[PDB]
Amino acid sequence: VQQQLEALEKSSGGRLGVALINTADNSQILYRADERFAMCSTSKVMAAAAVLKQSESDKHLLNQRVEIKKSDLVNYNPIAEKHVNGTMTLAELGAAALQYSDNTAMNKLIAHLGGPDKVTAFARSLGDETFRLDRTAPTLNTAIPGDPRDTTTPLAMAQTLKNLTLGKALAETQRAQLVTWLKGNTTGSASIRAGLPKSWVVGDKTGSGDYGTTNDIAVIWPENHAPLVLVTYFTQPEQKAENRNDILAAAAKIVT
Numbered sequence: 389v390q391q392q393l394e395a396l397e398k399s400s401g402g403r404l405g406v407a408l409i410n411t412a413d414n415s416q417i418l419y420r421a422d423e424r425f426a427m428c429s430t431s432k433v434m435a436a437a438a439v440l441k442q443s444e445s446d447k448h449l450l451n452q453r454v455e456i457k458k459s460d461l462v463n464y465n466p467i468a469e470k471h472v473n474g475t476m477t478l479a480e481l482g483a484a485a486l487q488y489s490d491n492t493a494m495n496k497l498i499a500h501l502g503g504p505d506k507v508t509a510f511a512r513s514l515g516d517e518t519f520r521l522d523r524t525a526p527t528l529n530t531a532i533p534g535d536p537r538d539t540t541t542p543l544a545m546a547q548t549l550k551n552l553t554l555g556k557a558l559a560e561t562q563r564a565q566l567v568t569w570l571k572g573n574t575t576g577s578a579s580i581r582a583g584l585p586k587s588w589v590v591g592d593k594t595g596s597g598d599y600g601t602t603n604d605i606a607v608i609w610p611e612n613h614a615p616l617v618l619v620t621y622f623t624q625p626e627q628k629a630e631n632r633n634d635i636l637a638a639a640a641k642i643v644t
């Protein structure tokens with residue numbers, strides 16, 4: 389598998405990061421898994437989960453109404469733009485952020501939490517010393533090579549995604565909500581999911597940025613085996629490189 393991933397990376401003209409955790413036995417498949425990559429919109433999982441954590445101690449939080457103003461709109465707001473002049477609840481914002489990658493929704497989550505550094509503190513509270521959120525959307529997607537802002541490593545994000553969706557991080561109702569959200573993602577068809585058997589159940593969150601940065605983080609439920617957690621991060625040397633969902637599908641196929 390390592391030679392395959394190396395050849396994929398070489399042909400691709402970029403930098404590939406993979407971390408697979410097989411929860412059957414905690415074995416792992418790692419490729420540049422301790423290297424930093426810009427998370428892009430995969431960071432939205434952490435923001436949504438931070439709000440879910442708060443909701444463990446505030447039974448009214450998810451139904452809290454948030455005003456959506458025309459000035460809130462940014463580059464991509466497929467759900468929030470339907471609600472300008474109206475409200476969305478925090479749950480609706482979590483769903484939009486995760487399932488459509490609505491950037492206004494992400495920003496509402498960040499603002500509710502008190503800014504990017506609060507998302508980082510939430511990651512720390514889960515045992516993730518690697519994640520950092522520095523900016524709002526869409527500037528968190530600049531993905532400049534070597535820029536530490538808005539980065540994590542494939543292994544750190546695989547570990548934390550496992551903890552969030554299958555493990556210790558959230559109380560049960562909140563864990564289940566996060567899983568429901570990820571399973572209902574609409575943006576990932578061509579990424580990790582395209583490299584897997586069609587009937588495996590998947591929850592995932594994609595991201596795309598400059599430098600052709602193309603990411604997906606997934607929890608995978610095979611029909612007859614324990615879950616897998618897979619992070620596929622990819623980035624390229626040139627700022628206007630095309631995004632490459634297909635590389636993520638290829639990586640997923642290789643490691644499964």
Ligand SMILES: *C(=O)[C@@H](NC(=O)Cc1ccccc1)[C@@H]1N[C@@H](C(=O)O)C(C)(C)S1
Pocket residue numbers: 427428429430463464488489491526529575593594595596597598631
């Ligand atoms: C998160 O990664 C967001 N990315 C951007 O807003 C920048 C961008 C990059 C390329 C094309 C359009 C916008 C959102 N998440 C990604 C994703 O999930 O792949 C989108 C392309 C849906 S925008």
Ligand SMILES: CC1(C)S[C@@H]2[C@H](NC(=O)Cc3ccccc3)C(=O)N2[C@H]1C(=O)O
Pocket residue numbers: 463464
């Ligand atoms: C890659 C694109 C075809 S899309 C990206 C950007 N558009 C947006 O940020 C809005 C948008 C976001 C998500 C989905 C659709 C549109 C924008 O413009 N971009 C294009 C480009 O660089 O050629």
Ligand SMILES: CC1(C)S[C@@H]2[C@H](NC(=O)Cc3ccccc3)C(=O)N2[C@H]1C(=O)O
Pocket residue numbers: 462463464526527529530597598
């Ligand atoms: C269609 C748009 C509203 S979105 C597109 C572009 N915005 C981006 O490309 C977002 C982005 C920011 C940072 C890193 C990557 C992508 C930008 O600006 N764009 C618009 C446009 O042409 O009017």
